[PDB]
Design a protein around this ligand. Structure first.
Ligand SMILES: O=C(O)c1cc(O)c(O)c(O)c1
Length: 366
């Protein structure tokens, strides 16, 4: 029954692979969970071939027994009392106000998701961008408030989807503030830059990992408070190893494979702070997974939502912000060995009780 979290996580991972491919040495943060969530919602508005494509890529039909309840249960678990403003997430779909909608579709949307498709009059362009940005502002407790991509909303815009998340976790064990210091970080083009790094020593759940194609990485787990979430960090051990070899095989099963081989060893960990924001225009990544009809103004099929339509998605966005920070004279217990994360690495944030992949990223330069 944690089955939908797996499928939703894997779909969102494949979307992240496509976006990583398009940004070679650029920082990127992303939510596998968020894109699956907004796309599971989009599913209900579609019919015919557009629907087939999305169900093929996602691996499940939203209408199917127990799929939506499960998603709902997961969202409610994410927003529960454990979460001290650590995570905000919002999904939304905006359709043009005028439209003759399919009878009984809006309520049925409400039954399955407990939220509504919004109606905006897109002919008041200036008003329509404000409404969208303010939605995202009000549902992320003000942490996210502008989407660049809304610059593209025009008079002819009829359907827009949006997803936004902010993450900033409390560590189970906080890094000591006095330990933070400037350290050399090696960038992928060979140059260096000085950056703040945190240090902590204790028993870290650790394993070495080899991809089937012979690429090596160090894998660390960092538990957040109460063990609800964890960050997995994956970093090459030499400088010429690409993150892609790892990213291109990434899955939920892959994390649980890490977890099964890990062991808690005493280590000094030195890790850069970072606060990163990414805005993704989802159309290429999604077309790349075969969801091409939805974006084409005649091939597109949203007849589950409206028959009075040429209806198609004019804008699909994800925006994400993630912060990893800590929460004189300076002392520590010595450890048999040191793990210095001074080269590009990937990270995964997971929801431990379901296995959901809430966030992933490659940090090329912090
Ligand atoms: O359908 C969701 O899970 C969702 C619901 C909301 O009410 C919301 O504000 C959001 O940003 C996402």
């Amino acid at each position: 029954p944690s089955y939908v979290a797996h499928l939703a996580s894997d779909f969102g991972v494949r979307v992240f692979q496509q976006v990583a491919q398009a940004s070679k040495d650029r920082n990127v943060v992303f939510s596998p969970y968020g894109v699956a969530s907004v796309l599971a919602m989009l599913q209900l508005t579609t019919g015919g071939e557009t629907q087939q494509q999305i169900q093929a890529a996602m691996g499940f039909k939203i209408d199917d027994k127990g799929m939506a309840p499960a998603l709902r249960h997961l969202y409610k678990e994410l927003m529960g009392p454990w979460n001290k403003d650590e995570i905000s997430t919002t999904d939304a779909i905006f359709v043009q106000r005028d439209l003759k909608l399919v009878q009984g579709f809006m309520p049925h949307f409400f039954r399955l998701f407990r939220s509504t498709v919004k109606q905006v009059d897109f002919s008041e362009v200036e008003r329509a961008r404000f409404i969208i940005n303010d939605w995202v502002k009000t549902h992320t407790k003000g942490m996210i408030s502008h989407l660049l991509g809304t610059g593209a909303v025009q008079q002819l815009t009829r359907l827009v989807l949006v997803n936004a998340l902010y993450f900033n976790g409390q560590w189970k064990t906080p890094f000591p503030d006095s330990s933070t210091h400037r350290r050399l970080f090696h960038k992928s083009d060979g140059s260096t830059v000085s950056v703040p790094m945190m240090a902590q020593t204790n028993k870290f759940n650790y394993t070495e990992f080899t991809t089937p194609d012979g690429h090596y990485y160090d894998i660390l787990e960092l538990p957040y408070h109460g063990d609800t979430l964890s960050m997995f960090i994956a970093a090459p051990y030499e400088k010429e190893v690409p993150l892609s070899a790892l990213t291109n095989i990434l899955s939920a099963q892959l994390i649980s494979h890490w977890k099964g081989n890990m062991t808690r060893l005493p280590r000094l960990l030195v890790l850069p702070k970072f606060s990163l924001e990414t805005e993704v225009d989802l159309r290429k990544p999604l077309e790349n997974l075969g969801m091409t009809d939805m974006f084409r103004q005649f091939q597109a099929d949203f007849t589950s939502l409206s028959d009075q339509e040429p209806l198609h998605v004019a804008l699909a966005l994800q925006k994400v912000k993630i912060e990893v920070n800590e929460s004189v004279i300076v002392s520590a217990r010595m450890a048999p060995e040191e793990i210095i994360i001074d080269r590009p690495f990937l990270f995964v944030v997971r929801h431990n009780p379901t296995g959901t992949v809430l966030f992933m990223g490659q940090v090329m330069e912090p």
